[PDB]
Amino acid sequence: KHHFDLNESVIYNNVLTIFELFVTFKPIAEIFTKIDGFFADYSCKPQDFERKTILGPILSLSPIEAAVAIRNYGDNLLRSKQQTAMIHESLQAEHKVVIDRLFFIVDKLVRGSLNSRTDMISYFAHIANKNHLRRADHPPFKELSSNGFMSNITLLL
């Protein structure tokens, strides 16, 4: 409540660092996986895994988000190959940085504890099996998880 996109380069870095301190401590990791709001609802809306769980607000960051691209490439609609390649080479480095930063999270998350790694596997699997509608010719995009999110988690795991 208080549009968590990748535009505000002075927010998401702080949000990531907020988890960065917790993830370091081994006693924190072994029990971080069993908290309130970690799992989403049992019958949660597929488009509601974005804003109704723990991780969903932090790893959903990806350049594919509509407004970021509207601001960058939609500003200069008739840009040539080099002009858009400028946006690419500008944003891909930030993308690589965030990917590596949150992989550091998930590594200790898996290396938290036995129940921790079981919980993370279950948490991914549950989001997966509720997205089979993605493979249709005209899938219900408004009823499915944003492809930025389900694509980010792919090369992450």
Add this chain to the structure above:
Amino acid sequence: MQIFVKTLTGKTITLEVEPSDTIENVKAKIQDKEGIPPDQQRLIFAGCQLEDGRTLSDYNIQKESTLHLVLRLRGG
């Protein structure tokens, strides 16, 4: 047994079917795997349409046969 079907874009979603099952019976197993209401369920086999109420064994559709999930002028 199992049979095949393909859309315009080339995707090949298989689905188990039974000789007793009618065309609407199999089309009921379509929106589950593609999210398509049967109001637009349009089936062509061997260039000929299929009757709505008729059963699977009404078109001699053997095992490992082929369907063609085509669409009418509906949607959009």
Add this chain to the structure above:
Amino acid sequence: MQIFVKTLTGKTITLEVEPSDTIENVKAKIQDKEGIPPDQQRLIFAGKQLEDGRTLSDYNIQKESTLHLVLRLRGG
């Protein structure tokens, strides 16, 4: 009236009829063993066609004359 009938592969049955009966009633002694639906009631007689709806006096079914039963695959 004993009229023989044989399928494509060579299997045959022994069935009884009456001279003034109908081919569907003769067919009614074809679904007694296998249970062949009337929609597939195909009769072949020496390069011609025998419609199901007519009678035995119109099909000139003689004594111990073998007819041809072939599974119908209608549709078009």
Add this chain to the structure above:
Amino acid sequence: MQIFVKTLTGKTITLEVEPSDTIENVKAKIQDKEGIPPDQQRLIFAGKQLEDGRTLSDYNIQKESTLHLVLRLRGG
């Protein structure tokens, strides 16, 4: 002595039980709320299926032992 069991979609549930309860009895205590066919009984403890004929006692089931309700076994 109630036990927990989770489905493929993960519906946590409770069911009071006894050491002598047979596995099929436990399954019969499931379709009350889930409406599952008991013939497709498939219960998973410690990565093992539960021998339906036996009871819970031959398994080292303890207080609030977790189970997995994976009984699709489909089908269609």
Add this chain to the structure above:
Amino acid sequence: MQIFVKTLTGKTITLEVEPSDTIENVKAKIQDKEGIPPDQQRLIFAGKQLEDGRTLSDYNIQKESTLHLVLRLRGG
């Protein structure tokens, strides 16, 4: 004073109580006279579920009246 309490089986028991007694007291008497747990007990009078914190005089319960007792809970 004596009143009538009916369980789900239709079993009628006469309970000799006083109007000043609370419904909790009545449920304790029921558990003493049959062993049935009081948390499962659901008393019905003229289509009204009663409260253990309240007494018989509160709901105009006269003697020789009929009370319907309802049980619940199962094997999970």
Add this chain to the structure above:
Amino acid sequence: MQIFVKTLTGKTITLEVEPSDTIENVKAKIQDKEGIPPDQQRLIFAGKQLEDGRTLSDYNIQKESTLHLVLRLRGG
């Protein structure tokens, strides 16, 4: 079993029955004259109800006992 029947206005018919029959079979001799559909098969017997689906041994139809046939106006 001669059982009389009379409608609201006082018109009556003379019909035959058997002691082991069913009320719908008794009704089958009620649509012989008017052609009354079975959906309107209403029987009235001394302030009670007589469902159509039962038999004459359950309706205790005595000898020359008049029943009541009233047009049904169901709906709701």
Add this chain to the structure above:
Amino acid sequence: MQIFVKTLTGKTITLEVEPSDTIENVKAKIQDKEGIPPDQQRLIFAGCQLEDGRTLSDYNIQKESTLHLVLRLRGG
């Protein structure tokens, strides 16, 4: 004979109907006078809906009776 029906705005379009005619039979005489496809044809009489296949004489709708052309949450 002729019967009545009214919309939400109060207009009273009459239309001849026949006792044999079904509810869809009369509703087929609706889009002609108001241009409403029977997909939304919703009829209420005396607060009770009418079954689709049911005929006119299935609701004792006498001459000079009243219908109520109401609409569902469809259209727009």
Add this chain to the structure above:
Amino acid sequence: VRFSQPFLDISYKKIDKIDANYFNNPSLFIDLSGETRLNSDFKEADAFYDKNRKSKPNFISDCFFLTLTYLHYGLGGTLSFEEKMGSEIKALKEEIEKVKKIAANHDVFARFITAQLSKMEKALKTTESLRFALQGFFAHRSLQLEVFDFICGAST
């Protein structure tokens, strides 16, 4: 409607000019399909057509009834047609602040949204124009006076 007032004279002398038996024969120019009747059914209507079994052409009588027919199917339809317009004006204004109460802080989606209400304010000014224009010519007392004169004469 102008052809009516001569035979609808305030002296009321041309009453016999319009035949009251004009609906004895079947129609000649006006439609009766779906034409509900006053206190008779089609079953009596078709029989009574024949029951007379005989037809003198006259423009006047045809024009008189065509006048009422166009009255009902015409501006009679128009008044109800605009009867929902006043509700439609409130409906259009209902979303006017609904799409403005949102955070309008986009780069080009904001420009598209502003173009989405640049036409909407013209739409409001047009719906209000229609609502305040249909009302005035209804308030054109001369025209309505003529119409009401025709109503009175036809009733007579």
Add this chain to the structure above:
Amino acid sequence: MSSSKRIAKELSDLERDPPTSSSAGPVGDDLYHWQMGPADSPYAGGVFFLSIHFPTDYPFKPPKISFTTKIYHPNINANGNICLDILKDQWSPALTLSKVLLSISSLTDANPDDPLVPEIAHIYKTDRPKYEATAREWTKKYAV
């Protein structure tokens, strides 16, 4: 002049002979404002709260009755309307409130020709298993 004298006796008939699976009487103090799912039915485990308002002509008119507990039945909507053919066709003056409660207890047997909720009526027509499952679902949901 005539109205009240029937209600008191029809009510005291409860004390004279209590019913099997029901209980009646005034909901509060009003005379005209009066207040158990069958085992062989998915309603089992359900006991119901009822709203009753006798009309001024109750001895000569059927009393309208409403539900307070939601149910899943074809002949019942959310407004508790009862498709009892007695009340609107042959609600004789001699029919007791107890007899009316008995006819209600007959609702159990569903009438398919009176599809107050046709969505549930077709399910009763072919989908009895899920019908009985959902009836118990709502039984445990509302009619505790």
